[PDB]
Amino acid sequence: IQNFYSLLGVSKTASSREIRQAFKKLALKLHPDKNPNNPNAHGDFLKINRAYEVLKDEDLRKKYDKYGEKGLEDNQGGQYESWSYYRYDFGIYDDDPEIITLERREFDAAVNSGELWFVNFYSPGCSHCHDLAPTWREFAKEVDGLLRIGAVNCGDDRMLCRMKGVNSYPSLFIFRSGMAAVKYNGDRSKESLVAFAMQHVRSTVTEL
């Protein structure tokens, strides 16, 4: 019997990252715009997209896990993006193991834990975010293990970004439980990011 998990080819315990990756693979092969000679391409993709939109959201996935398709409509999940969007603007940091992409629950835990986190708040369709992406990845490798490096997709949770006083993108903030967040305001070079992160790593909560 079909369910959203088996439709995407993933386990019921898959992470949000695994779910994006499985969905993306389906999209890059099957997108209707790329398969115009196939009349069912549109309908088939609508079903995969509807699955993805439920599983991507923690509340909606919990509800689905518990009750199946309760309260869903047969034709919801109908608005999908271009092939190019899935190819270049979707799950941006999913193949960068040095960067953790945080959803709301995990973001709140991160900032409460006491660990030092430096988080890139970005949004889909953002040219400055794409410009910064390769450098954020290179930076995350350089400082790997010295502090925690995060990313938040504001496209997926606008209110989280709003809550944290993020209204323009990219916005880079460093956080540690018990201290006020500090915004990064440098030139976005890899050496600038490193020098900024490292002053905060050096500051512990005490000094010599």
Coordinates of N, CA and C in Angstrom, one line a residue:
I1 N 0.9 -1.2 0.0 CA 0.0 0.0 0.0 C 0.9 1.2 0.0
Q2 N 0.7 2.2 -0.9 CA 1.6 3.3 -1.1 C 1.5 4.3 0.1
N3 N 2.6 4.9 0.4 CA 2.6 6.0 1.4 C 3.6 7.0 1.0
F4 N 3.7 8.1 1.7 CA 4.6 9.2 1.2 C 6.0 8.8 1.2
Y5 N 6.4 8.0 2.2 CA 7.8 7.5 2.3 C 8.2 6.6 1.1
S6 N 7.4 5.6 0.9 CA 7.7 4.7 -0.2 C 7.6 5.4 -1.6
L7 N 6.7 6.4 -1.7 CA 6.7 7.2 -2.9 C 8.0 7.9 -3.2
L8 N 8.6 8.4 -2.1 CA 9.9 9.1 -2.3 C 11.1 8.1 -2.3
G9 N 10.8 6.8 -1.9 CA 11.8 5.7 -1.8 C 12.7 5.9 -0.6
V10 N 12.2 6.4 0.5 CA 13.0 6.6 1.8 C 12.3 5.9 2.9
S11 N 13.0 5.7 4.0 CA 12.5 5.2 5.2 C 11.6 6.1 6.0
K12 N 10.7 5.5 6.8 CA 9.9 6.3 7.7 C 10.7 7.1 8.7
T13 N 11.9 6.7 9.0 CA 12.8 7.4 9.9 C 13.7 8.4 9.2
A14 N 13.6 8.6 7.9 CA 14.5 9.5 7.2 C 14.6 10.8 7.8
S15 N 15.7 11.5 7.8 CA 15.9 12.9 8.2 C 15.2 13.8 7.1
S16 N 15.1 15.1 7.4 CA 14.6 16.1 6.4 C 15.6 16.2 5.3
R17 N 16.9 16.2 5.6 CA 17.9 16.2 4.5 C 17.7 15.0 3.6
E18 N 17.5 13.8 4.1 CA 17.3 12.6 3.2 C 16.2 12.7 2.3
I19 N 15.1 13.1 2.9 CA 13.8 13.4 2.2 C 14.1 14.4 1.0
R20 N 14.8 15.5 1.3 CA 15.1 16.5 0.2 C 15.8 15.8 -0.9
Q21 N 16.9 15.1 -0.5 CA 17.7 14.5 -1.5 C 16.9 13.5 -2.4
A22 N 16.0 12.7 -1.8 CA 15.3 11.7 -2.6 C 14.4 12.4 -3.5
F23 N 13.6 13.4 -3.0 CA 12.7 14.3 -3.8 C 13.5 15.0 -4.9
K24 N 14.6 15.6 -4.6 CA 15.4 16.2 -5.7 C 15.8 15.3 -6.8
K25 N 16.2 14.1 -6.5 CA 16.6 13.2 -7.6 C 15.4 12.9 -8.5
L26 N 14.2 12.7 -7.9 CA 13.0 12.5 -8.6 C 12.7 13.7 -9.5
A27 N 12.8 14.9 -8.9 CA 12.6 16.1 -9.7 C 13.6 16.4 -10.9
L28 N 14.9 16.1 -10.7 CA 15.8 16.4 -11.8 C 15.6 15.4 -13.0
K29 N 15.0 14.2 -12.7 CA 14.8 13.3 -13.8 C 13.4 13.6 -14.4
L30 N 12.4 13.8 -13.6 CA 11.0 13.7 -14.0 C 10.3 15.0 -14.2
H31 N 10.9 16.2 -13.9 CA 10.2 17.4 -14.0 C 9.4 17.5 -15.3
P32 N 8.1 17.9 -15.2 CA 7.2 18.1 -16.4 C 7.8 19.0 -17.5
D33 N 8.4 20.1 -17.1 CA 9.0 21.0 -18.1 C 10.1 20.3 -18.9
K34 N 10.7 19.4 -18.3 CA 11.8 18.7 -19.0 C 11.3 17.4 -19.7
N35 N 10.1 17.1 -19.6 CA 9.5 15.9 -20.2 C 8.2 16.2 -20.9
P36 N 8.2 17.1 -21.9 CA 6.9 17.6 -22.4 C 6.2 16.6 -23.3
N37 N 7.0 15.6 -23.7 CA 6.4 14.6 -24.5 C 5.6 13.6 -23.8
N38 N 5.7 13.6 -22.4 CA 5.0 12.7 -21.5 C 3.8 13.4 -20.9
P39 N 2.6 13.1 -21.3 CA 1.3 13.7 -20.8 C 1.1 13.5 -19.3
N40 N 1.5 12.4 -18.7 CA 1.4 12.1 -17.3 C 2.5 12.7 -16.4
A41 N 3.5 13.3 -17.0 CA 4.6 13.9 -16.2 C 4.1 14.8 -15.2
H42 N 3.2 15.7 -15.6 CA 2.6 16.7 -14.7 C 1.9 16.0 -13.5
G43 N 1.0 15.1 -13.7 CA 0.2 14.4 -12.7 C 1.1 13.7 -11.7
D44 N 2.0 12.9 -12.2 CA 3.0 12.1 -11.5 C 3.8 13.1 -10.5
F45 N 4.3 14.2 -11.1 CA 5.1 15.1 -10.2 C 4.3 15.8 -9.1
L46 N 3.0 16.1 -9.4 CA 2.1 16.7 -8.4 C 2.1 15.8 -7.2
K47 N 2.0 14.4 -7.4 CA 1.9 13.5 -6.3 C 3.2 13.5 -5.5
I48 N 4.3 13.5 -6.2 CA 5.6 13.5 -5.5 C 5.8 14.8 -4.7
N49 N 5.4 15.9 -5.4 CA 5.5 17.2 -4.7 C 4.6 17.3 -3.4
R50 N 3.4 16.8 -3.5 CA 2.4 16.8 -2.4 C 3.0 16.0 -1.2
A51 N 3.6 14.8 -1.5 CA 4.3 14.0 -0.5 C 5.4 14.8 0.2
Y52 N 6.3 15.4 -0.7 CA 7.4 16.2 -0.2 C 6.9 17.4 0.7
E53 N 5.9 18.0 0.3 CA 5.4 19.2 1.1 C 4.9 18.8 2.4
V54 N 4.4 17.6 2.6 CA 3.9 17.2 3.9 C 5.1 16.7 4.8
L55 N 6.0 15.9 4.2 CA 7.1 15.3 4.9 C 8.1 16.4 5.3
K56 N 8.2 17.4 4.5 CA 9.2 18.5 4.8 C 8.8 19.3 6.1
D57 N 7.6 19.3 6.5 CA 7.2 20.2 7.6 C 7.0 19.3 8.9
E58 N 7.7 19.7 10.0 CA 7.6 18.8 11.2 C 6.2 18.5 11.7
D59 N 5.4 19.5 11.8 CA 4.0 19.4 12.2 C 3.2 18.5 11.3
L60 N 3.3 18.7 10.0 CA 2.5 18.0 9.0 C 3.0 16.5 8.9
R61 N 4.3 16.3 9.0 CA 4.8 14.9 9.0 C 4.3 14.2 10.3
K62 N 4.3 14.8 11.4 CA 3.9 14.2 12.7 C 2.5 13.7 12.6
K63 N 1.6 14.6 12.0 CA 0.2 14.3 11.8 C 0.1 13.1 10.8
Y64 N 0.8 13.2 9.7 CA 0.8 12.1 8.7 C 1.2 10.8 9.3
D65 N 2.3 10.8 10.1 CA 2.8 9.6 10.8 C 1.8 9.0 11.6
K66 N 1.0 9.8 12.3 CA 0.0 9.4 13.2 C -1.3 8.9 12.6
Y67 N -1.8 9.7 11.6 CA -3.1 9.5 11.1 C -3.2 9.3 9.6
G68 N -2.1 9.1 8.9 CA -2.2 9.2 7.4 C -2.7 10.5 6.9
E69 N -3.5 10.5 5.9 CA -3.7 11.7 5.1 C -4.9 12.6 5.7
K70 N -5.1 12.4 6.9 CA -6.2 13.1 7.6 C -6.1 14.7 7.3
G71 N -7.2 15.3 7.0 CA -7.2 16.7 6.7 C -6.5 17.2 5.4
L72 N -5.9 16.3 4.7 CA -5.3 16.7 3.4 C -6.3 16.7 2.3
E73 N -6.1 17.4 1.2 CA -6.9 17.4 0.0 C -6.2 16.7 -1.1
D74 N -7.0 16.0 -2.0 CA -6.4 15.3 -3.1 C -5.6 16.2 -4.1
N75 N -6.0 17.4 -4.2 CA -5.3 18.3 -5.1 C -4.4 19.4 -4.5
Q76 N -4.1 19.3 -3.2 CA -3.1 20.2 -2.6 C -1.7 19.8 -3.0
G77 N -0.7 20.6 -2.7 CA 0.7 20.4 -3.2 C 0.9 20.5 -4.7
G78 N 0.1 21.4 -5.3 CA 0.1 21.6 -6.7 C 1.1 22.6 -7.3
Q79 N 1.8 23.3 -6.4 CA 2.6 24.5 -6.9 C 4.0 24.1 -6.8
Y80 N 4.7 23.8 -8.0 CA 6.0 23.4 -7.9 C 6.9 24.4 -8.7
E81 N 8.2 24.3 -8.5 CA 9.1 25.2 -9.1 C 9.7 24.7 -10.3
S82 N 10.6 25.5 -11.0 CA 11.3 25.1 -12.2 C 12.3 24.0 -11.9
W83 N 12.7 23.3 -13.0 CA 13.8 22.3 -12.9 C 15.0 23.0 -12.4
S84 N 15.3 24.2 -12.9 CA 16.5 25.0 -12.5 C 16.5 25.3 -10.9
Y85 N 15.3 25.6 -10.4 CA 15.2 25.7 -9.0 C 15.6 24.5 -8.3
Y86 N 15.2 23.3 -8.7 CA 15.6 22.0 -8.0 C 17.1 21.7 -8.2
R87 N 17.6 22.1 -9.4 CA 19.0 21.8 -9.7 C 19.9 22.6 -8.9
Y88 N 19.6 23.9 -8.7 CA 20.6 24.8 -8.2 C 20.2 25.5 -6.9
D89 N 18.9 25.5 -6.6 CA 18.4 26.4 -5.5 C 17.6 25.7 -4.4
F90 N 17.9 24.4 -4.3 CA 17.1 23.5 -3.4 C 18.1 22.6 -2.6
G91 N 17.9 22.6 -1.3 CA 18.8 21.8 -0.4 C 20.2 22.2 -0.5
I92 N 20.5 23.5 -0.5 CA 21.8 24.1 -0.9 C 23.0 23.4 -0.3
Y93 N 22.9 23.2 1.0 CA 24.1 22.7 1.7 C 24.0 21.2 2.1
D94 N 23.1 20.5 1.4 CA 22.9 19.0 1.7 C 24.0 18.1 1.4
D95 N 24.9 18.5 0.5 CA 26.1 17.7 0.2 C 27.4 18.3 0.8
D96 N 27.3 19.2 1.8 CA 28.4 19.7 2.6 C 28.3 19.3 4.0
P97 N 29.0 18.2 4.4 CA 28.8 17.6 5.7 C 29.3 18.5 6.8
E98 N 30.1 19.5 6.5 CA 30.6 20.5 7.5 C 29.6 21.5 8.0
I99 N 28.4 21.6 7.3 CA 27.4 22.5 7.5 C 26.1 21.8 7.9
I100 N 25.5 22.3 9.1 CA 24.3 21.6 9.4 C 23.1 22.6 9.0
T101 N 22.1 22.0 8.2 CA 21.0 22.9 7.9 C 19.9 22.6 8.9
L102 N 19.5 23.7 9.6 CA 18.7 23.6 10.9 C 17.3 24.0 10.5
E103 N 16.4 23.2 10.9 CA 15.0 23.6 11.0 C 14.6 24.1 12.4
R104 N 13.4 24.6 12.6 CA 13.1 25.3 13.9 C 13.5 24.5 15.2
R105 N 13.1 23.3 15.3 CA 13.4 22.5 16.6 C 14.9 22.5 16.8
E106 N 15.6 22.1 15.8 CA 17.1 21.9 15.9 C 17.8 23.3 16.1
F107 N 17.2 24.3 15.4 CA 17.8 25.7 15.6 C 17.7 26.1 17.1
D108 N 16.5 26.0 17.7 CA 16.3 26.3 19.1 C 17.2 25.5 20.0
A109 N 17.3 24.2 19.8 CA 18.2 23.4 20.6 C 19.7 23.9 20.4
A110 N 20.1 24.1 19.2 CA 21.5 24.7 19.0 C 21.7 25.9 19.8
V111 N 20.8 26.9 19.7 CA 21.1 28.2 20.4 C 20.9 28.0 22.0
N112 N 20.3 27.0 22.4 CA 20.1 26.7 23.9 C 21.2 25.9 24.5
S113 N 21.9 25.1 23.6 CA 22.8 24.1 24.1 C 24.0 24.7 24.8
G114 N 24.5 25.9 24.5 CA 25.8 26.4 25.0 C 26.9 26.3 24.0
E115 N 26.7 25.6 22.9 CA 27.8 25.5 21.9 C 27.8 26.7 21.0
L116 N 29.0 27.1 20.5 CA 29.1 28.3 19.7 C 28.6 28.0 18.2
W117 N 27.6 28.6 17.7 CA 27.1 28.4 16.4 C 27.2 29.6 15.5
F118 N 27.6 29.5 14.2 CA 27.6 30.6 13.3 C 26.7 30.1 12.2
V119 N 25.6 30.8 12.0 CA 24.5 30.4 11.1 C 24.3 31.4 10.0
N120 N 24.2 30.9 8.8 CA 23.9 31.6 7.6 C 22.4 31.5 7.3
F121 N 21.7 32.6 7.5 CA 20.2 32.7 7.2 C 20.1 33.1 5.7
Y122 N 19.6 32.2 4.9 CA 19.5 32.5 3.4 C 18.1 32.3 2.9
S123 N 17.8 32.6 1.7 CA 16.5 32.5 1.1 C 16.6 32.0 -0.3
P124 N 15.7 31.2 -0.8 CA 15.8 30.8 -2.2 C 15.7 32.0 -3.2
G125 N 16.2 31.9 -4.4 CA 16.1 33.1 -5.3 C 17.0 34.3 -4.9
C126 N 18.0 34.0 -4.2 CA 18.8 35.2 -3.6 C 20.2 35.1 -4.2
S127 N 20.5 36.1 -5.1 CA 21.7 36.1 -5.8 C 22.9 36.3 -4.9
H128 N 22.8 37.1 -3.8 CA 23.9 37.3 -2.8 C 24.2 36.0 -2.0
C129 N 23.1 35.3 -1.7 CA 23.2 34.0 -1.1 C 23.9 33.0 -2.0
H130 N 23.6 32.9 -3.3 CA 24.4 32.1 -4.1 C 25.8 32.5 -4.2
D131 N 26.1 33.7 -4.2 CA 27.4 34.2 -4.3 C 28.3 33.8 -3.1
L132 N 27.7 33.8 -2.0 CA 28.3 33.5 -0.7 C 28.5 31.9 -0.5
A133 N 27.5 31.1 -1.0 CA 27.6 29.7 -0.9 C 28.9 29.0 -1.0
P134 N 29.7 29.2 -2.1 CA 30.9 28.4 -2.2 C 31.9 28.8 -1.0
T135 N 31.9 30.1 -0.7 CA 32.8 30.5 0.4 C 32.3 30.0 1.8
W136 N 31.0 30.0 2.0 CA 30.5 29.4 3.3 C 31.0 28.0 3.4
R137 N 30.9 27.2 2.3 CA 31.4 25.8 2.3 C 32.9 25.7 2.5
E138 N 33.7 26.6 1.9 CA 35.1 26.5 2.1 C 35.5 26.9 3.5
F139 N 34.8 27.9 4.0 CA 35.0 28.4 5.4 C 34.7 27.2 6.4
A140 N 33.5 26.6 6.2 CA 33.1 25.5 7.1 C 34.1 24.3 7.1
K141 N 34.7 24.1 6.0 CA 35.8 23.1 6.0 C 37.0 23.5 6.8
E142 N 37.3 24.8 6.7 CA 38.5 25.3 7.4 C 38.4 25.3 8.9
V143 N 37.3 25.7 9.4 CA 37.0 25.7 10.8 C 36.3 24.5 11.4
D144 N 36.2 23.4 10.6 CA 35.5 22.2 11.0 C 35.9 21.7 12.4
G145 N 34.9 21.6 13.3 CA 35.2 21.1 14.6 C 35.5 22.1 15.6
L146 N 35.8 23.3 15.2 CA 36.3 24.4 16.1 C 35.1 25.2 16.7
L147 N 34.0 25.2 15.9 CA 32.7 25.7 16.3 C 31.7 25.1 15.3
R148 N 30.4 25.3 15.6 CA 29.4 24.7 14.8 C 28.9 25.6 13.7
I149 N 28.8 25.1 12.5 CA 28.5 26.0 11.4 C 27.1 25.5 10.9
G150 N 26.2 26.5 10.8 CA 24.8 26.2 10.5 C 24.3 27.0 9.3
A151 N 23.1 26.6 8.8 CA 22.4 27.3 7.7 C 21.0 27.2 8.0
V152 N 20.2 28.3 7.7 CA 18.8 28.2 7.9 C 18.1 28.7 6.6
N153 N 17.2 27.9 6.0 CA 16.5 28.3 4.8 C 15.2 29.0 5.2
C154 N 15.3 30.3 5.2 CA 14.2 31.2 5.4 C 13.0 31.0 4.5
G155 N 13.2 30.4 3.3 CA 12.1 30.0 2.4 C 11.2 29.0 3.1
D156 N 11.8 28.1 3.8 CA 11.0 27.1 4.5 C 10.4 27.5 5.9
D157 N 10.9 28.5 6.5 CA 10.3 29.0 7.8 C 10.5 30.5 8.0
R158 N 9.6 31.3 7.4 CA 9.8 32.8 7.4 C 9.7 33.3 8.7
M159 N 8.9 32.7 9.6 CA 8.6 33.3 10.9 C 9.8 33.1 11.8
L160 N 10.5 31.9 11.6 CA 11.8 31.7 12.3 C 12.7 32.9 12.0
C161 N 12.9 33.2 10.7 CA 13.8 34.3 10.3 C 13.3 35.6 10.9
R162 N 12.0 35.8 10.8 CA 11.5 37.1 11.3 C 11.8 37.2 12.8
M163 N 11.6 36.1 13.5 CA 11.8 36.1 15.0 C 13.2 36.5 15.3
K164 N 14.1 36.0 14.5 CA 15.5 36.3 14.8 C 16.0 37.6 14.2
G165 N 15.1 38.4 13.8 CA 15.4 39.8 13.3 C 16.1 39.7 11.9
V166 N 15.8 38.7 11.1 CA 16.3 38.5 9.8 C 15.3 38.9 8.7
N167 N 15.6 40.1 8.0 CA 14.6 40.5 7.0 C 15.3 40.7 5.6
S168 N 16.6 40.4 5.5 CA 17.3 40.5 4.3 C 18.3 39.4 4.3
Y169 N 18.9 39.0 3.1 CA 19.6 37.8 3.0 C 20.8 38.0 2.1
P170 N 21.9 37.3 2.4 CA 22.1 36.4 3.5 C 22.3 37.2 4.8
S171 N 22.0 36.6 5.9 CA 22.2 37.3 7.2 C 23.0 36.2 8.1
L172 N 24.2 36.6 8.5 CA 25.1 35.7 9.2 C 25.2 36.1 10.7
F173 N 24.8 35.2 11.6 CA 24.8 35.6 13.0 C 25.5 34.5 13.8
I174 N 26.3 34.9 14.8 CA 26.9 33.9 15.7 C 26.1 33.9 17.0
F175 N 25.9 32.7 17.6 CA 25.0 32.5 18.7 C 25.8 31.7 19.8
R176 N 25.5 32.0 21.0 CA 25.9 31.0 22.1 C 24.9 31.2 23.3
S177 N 24.3 30.2 23.7 CA 23.4 30.2 24.9 C 24.0 31.2 26.0
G178 N 23.1 32.1 26.5 CA 23.5 33.0 27.5 C 24.1 34.3 27.0
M179 N 24.3 34.4 25.7 CA 24.9 35.6 25.1 C 24.0 36.1 24.0
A180 N 24.0 37.5 23.8 CA 23.3 38.1 22.7 C 23.9 37.7 21.4
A181 N 23.1 37.3 20.4 CA 23.6 37.1 19.0 C 24.4 38.2 18.5
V182 N 25.4 37.9 17.8 CA 26.2 39.0 17.1 C 26.2 38.8 15.6
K183 N 25.8 39.8 14.8 CA 25.7 39.8 13.4 C 27.1 40.0 12.8
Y184 N 27.5 39.2 11.8 CA 28.7 39.4 11.0 C 28.4 40.5 10.0
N185 N 29.4 41.5 10.0 CA 29.3 42.6 9.0 C 30.5 42.8 8.1
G186 N 31.3 41.7 7.9 CA 32.5 41.8 7.1 C 32.3 41.7 5.6
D187 N 33.4 41.4 4.9 CA 33.4 41.5 3.4 C 33.0 40.1 2.8
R188 N 32.7 39.2 3.6 CA 32.3 37.8 3.2 C 33.4 37.0 2.6
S189 N 34.6 37.5 2.6 CA 35.7 36.6 2.2 C 36.0 35.5 3.1
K190 N 36.5 34.4 2.6 CA 36.8 33.3 3.5 C 37.7 33.7 4.7
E191 N 38.7 34.5 4.4 CA 39.6 34.9 5.5 C 38.9 35.8 6.6
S192 N 38.0 36.6 6.1 CA 37.2 37.5 7.0 C 36.3 36.6 7.9
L193 N 35.6 35.6 7.3 CA 34.7 34.7 8.1 C 35.5 33.9 9.1
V194 N 36.7 33.4 8.7 CA 37.6 32.7 9.6 C 38.0 33.6 10.8
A195 N 38.5 34.8 10.5 CA 39.0 35.8 11.5 C 37.8 36.1 12.5
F196 N 36.6 36.3 11.9 CA 35.5 36.6 12.8 C 35.1 35.4 13.7
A197 N 35.0 34.2 13.1 CA 34.6 33.0 13.8 C 35.6 32.7 14.9
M198 N 36.9 32.9 14.6 CA 38.0 32.6 15.5 C 38.1 33.5 16.7
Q199 N 37.8 34.8 16.5 CA 37.7 35.6 17.7 C 36.6 35.1 18.7
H200 N 35.5 34.6 18.1 CA 34.5 34.2 19.0 C 34.8 32.8 19.7
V201 N 35.5 32.0 18.9 CA 36.0 30.7 19.4 C 36.9 31.0 20.6
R202 N 37.9 31.9 20.4 CA 38.9 32.3 21.4 C 38.2 32.9 22.7
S203 N 37.3 33.8 22.5 CA 36.5 34.2 23.7 C 35.9 33.0 24.1
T204 N 36.2 32.5 25.3 CA 35.3 31.5 25.7 C 34.2 32.2 26.5
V205 N 33.9 31.8 27.7 CA 33.0 32.6 28.6 C 34.0 33.3 29.6
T206 N 35.2 32.8 29.7 CA 36.3 33.4 30.5 C 37.5 33.7 29.7
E207 N 38.4 34.4 30.4 CA 39.7 34.9 29.8 C 40.9 34.6 30.6
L208 N 42.0 34.7 30.0 CA 43.3 34.7 30.8 C 43.8 36.2 30.9

